[PDB]
Amino acid sequence: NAIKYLGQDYENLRARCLQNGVLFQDDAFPPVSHSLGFKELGPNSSKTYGIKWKRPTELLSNPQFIVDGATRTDICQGALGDCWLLAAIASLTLNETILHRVVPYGQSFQEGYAGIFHFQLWQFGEWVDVVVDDLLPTKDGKLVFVHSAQGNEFWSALLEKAYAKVNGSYEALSGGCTSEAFEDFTGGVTEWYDLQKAPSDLYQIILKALERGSLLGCSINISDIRDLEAITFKNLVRGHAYSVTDAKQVTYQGQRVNLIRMRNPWGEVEWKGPWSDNSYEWNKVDPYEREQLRVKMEDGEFWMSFRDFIREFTKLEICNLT
Ligand SMILES: CC[C@H](NC(=O)[C@H](CC(C)C)NC(=O)OCc1ccccc1)[C@H](O)C(=O)NCCCn1cnc2c(N)ncnc21
Ligand SMILES: [Ca+2]
Ligand SMILES: [Ca+2]
Ligand SMILES: [Cl-]
Ligand SMILES: [Cl-]
Ligand SMILES: [Cl-]
Secondary structure: OOEEHHHOOHHHHHHHHHHHOOOOOOOOOOOOHHHHOOOOOOOOOHHHHOOEEEOHHHHOOOOEOOOOOOOHHHOEOOOOOOHHHHHHHHHHOOOHHHHHHHOOOOOOOOOOOOOEEEEEEEEOOEEEEEEEEOOEEEEOOEEOOOEOOOOOEOHHHHHHHHHHHHHOOOHHHOOOOHHHHHHHHHOOEEEEEEHHHOOOOHHHHHHHHHHHOOEEEEEOOOOOOOOOOOEOOOOOEOOOOEEEEEEEEEEEOOEEEEEEEEEOOOOOOOOOOOOOOOOHHHHHOOHHHHHHHOOOOOOOEEEEEHHHHHHHOOEEEEEEOO
């Protein structure tokens, strides 16, 4: 059983809030500017001034903790430098077992709701249960930071809040390492690969890792400063964490081609090269493969050939667990 971060006891706090007829407000991570940040999100910053803390039950008549499953399309980045974290959460959703260790079952805005939620993380060398109240940063009625493509779904916003809490503020999340989030969700072992020196069996390594439910992420180093822009000519984002979400082989004019699928945690802005959603390559595979694999949607998720992947990307991170 997870031990309680700061000694805060989820079920006890929830039960006592319900008894006392109030909603939880978290003394350890309160709905004030110091929970937002210290510089870019500090008390006197332009960003801080626009933000009002509001509960999902203040925003909507029918807020939901999870809608149609806790899945990667529920991870759409907001105005914060936490792409590394969000890439990790998106990858986490592909492994139901680990997902629901981090996101406990049984949390809702209906029966038993008292304005408090909890998540479990690997921290300080322990599995720790972290509570949050459900006051969330909003501007004009919309979440400022992470949000789901399902506008009434709140689990991922609440998990990002819990992760900010253990790190001190949302601003403390700006700029980071995907592998650190992977570890914090698993207590597993992380390794990384230099794609410009890829082992010859790297694609099989990826296949095996995906099959076992390991977490995979990738990025493109900014080698100059951000000279050729943050965005490459083919619509990739440099210095930015992507989730690796599948690896599948297709038959392209009668020959096997290894593909890899990844997802930009923005939930938008995708590769426009071969195998992209609108590319001509799809016209020359088996119709069944096309139907199974290709999804024509601006959703941040796309395929690349493994060959193009290892040319365009520079780093692959893998977190292996038990
Ligand atoms: C810094 C950028 C973030 N990148 C990083 O963290 C990188 C991640 C690695 C895997 C390359 N790491 C990093 O730099 O190390 C900094 C480091 C390491 C250790 C200690 C302190 C600082 C990330 O790209 C990000 O969060 N971008 C969000 C951009 C705003 N935005 C949000 N929605 C957007 C949208 N729809 N469209 C356009 N922009 C959007
Ligand atoms: Ca969902
Ligand atoms: Ca897509
Ligand atoms: Cl408390
Ligand atoms: Cl303030
Ligand atoms: Cl609910």
